[PDB]
């Protein structure tokens with residue numbers, strides 16, 4: 375099988391460790407790195423490569439991402455080109471993707487995915503314990519959108535639909551390559567597209583639980599996620615009219631108790647986030663708010679003078695979400711900035727009224743939120 379590591383600016387020592395772990399595994403036929411550009415990281419990998427190819431007997435290739443879609447060129451081009459390499463230049467049955475910056479990686483990850491495919495699954499996704507203030511795009515954008523748009527489907531039940539640790543069978547890789555909406559999705563929206571399309575195609579899905587957890591970057595304010603946010607939301611919005619034709623077998627390994635060191639992390643700088651909410655305003659943003667419900671309109675306007683976010687509760691976010699589905703314009707800086715601030719207030723509301731009540735309370739809240747959104751969407 376093919377194990378792929380997409381990379382951009384990673385410390386190279388860490389990546390090559392994972393490549394070496396992957397190269398040593400008995401069920402791996404070939405490791406492949408797919409890079410952003412020929413940079414400091416890329417060269418270091420190209421050099422270290424054929425040494426590991428012979429020390430383990432497994433072919434390790436480096437290659438550059440090919441421009442395959444119509445959007446900012448990012449992770450999506452990277453994964454879509456690995457898809458092309460996999461399908462056009464190898465005969466392997468299965469392809470793994472793992473993020474290049476994992477520090478807790480080991481052979482079990484590959485073993486567990488492989489064995490679940492043996493069992494008959496077409497797609498295996500890995501999922502991880504997360505802190506209560508992590509994954510706010512996952513929860514407030516992707517899972518929320520899936521739930522409001524396709525409440526009867528398996529979409530909103532996928533644990534980590536932005537997750538880049540997965541395994542596909544060859545015909546799943548092929549079905550996704552042949553898909554226009556997917557090929558197009560060159561930016562951060564790629565994971566959303568893989569998730570939506572594998573589910574809508576009735577691929578059978580298993581989710582393995584990785585107790586180690588995954589290690590996330592040091593955080594400032596939420597603005598470190600602004601681009602991801604805009605792109606993840608545009609992906610959902612671009613699918614809003616699609617129909618999901620058929621059901622899917624979907625099963626998930628029972629999760630362990632969250633490790634204490636993961637429960638006890640804080641995901642982002644609150645002070646910086648509150649500050650950033652008062653910046654980058656334009657009169658056009660003020661006027662664009664006229665499209666939103668009165669409490670959201672006056673709440674966000676208040677942020678010009680002091681931080682406000684009590685108003686952005688669950689119902690207010692659902693109403694806000696529908697307005698954005700209809701009126702948000704990808705690439706319009708004022709829409710991107712409003713999206714970003716609206717979401718910030720949602721994250722802050724959740725953090726102070728829910729996460730602050732404790733880990734268990736927050737988990738329970740997030741699943742119940744999805745359930746209320748689904749029930750509401752099915753009513754309309």
Ligand SMILES: Nc1nc2c(ncn2[C@@H]2O[C@H](COP(=O)(O)OP(=O)(O)O)[C@@H](O)[C@H]2O)c(=O)[nH]1
Pocket residue numbers: 379380381382383384408409410439447448449450451452453472473474475538591
């Ligand atoms: N080829 C390619 N890989 C990327 C790009 N952007 C991110 N990656 C890789 O995709 C993975 C996720 O990136 P990262 O910044 O760690 O995102 P996060 O883990 O979701 O916070 C890492 O393995 C990155 O090296 C890109 O534009 N092209």
Ligand SMILES: [Cl-]
Pocket residue numbers: 508509510511512513536
């Ligand atoms: Cl996320």
Ligand SMILES: [Mg+2]
Pocket residue numbers: 473475589590591
């Ligand atoms: Mg990461």
